């Protein structure tokens, strides 16, 4: 049920993600960005009133994050909308230029 179009950025740096997330001061706000290392993404998110980043590693057709693994990035995000990602924080508010304009 997570929708990549609402949170995914193919081309966005860490600094740009931070500038976006500063504008929506809600824990659980997040976006996902491709990194310029192969088979790598970052989830940039707010938790504990701060902006943090975690890496997601692709291996073959699956993506890995800590003790967890999924058939797609969309499925990983779906899972962490239902289960906590960082301490008690779940992914809650997908952030994009569209969201921010509103």
């Amino acid at each position: 049920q997570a929708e990549s179009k609402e949170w995914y950025h193919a081309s966005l740096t860490r600094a740009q993600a931070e500038h976006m997330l500063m504008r929506v001061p809600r824990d659980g706000a997040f976006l996902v960005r491709k990194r310029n290392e192969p088979n790598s993404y970052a989830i940039s998110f707010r938790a504990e009133g701060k902006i943090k980043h975690c890496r997601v590693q692709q291996e073959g057709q699956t993506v890995m994050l800590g003790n967890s693994e999924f058939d797609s990035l969309v499925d990983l995000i779906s899972y962490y909308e239902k289960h906590p990602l960082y301490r008690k924080m779940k992914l809650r508010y997908p952030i994009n230029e569209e969201a921010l304009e509103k």
Partner: peptide, 8 residues
């Protein structure tokens, strides 16, 4: 952690 944190 460093520049990136570990997920649960």
């Amino acid at each position: 952690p460093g520049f990136y944190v570990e997920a649960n």
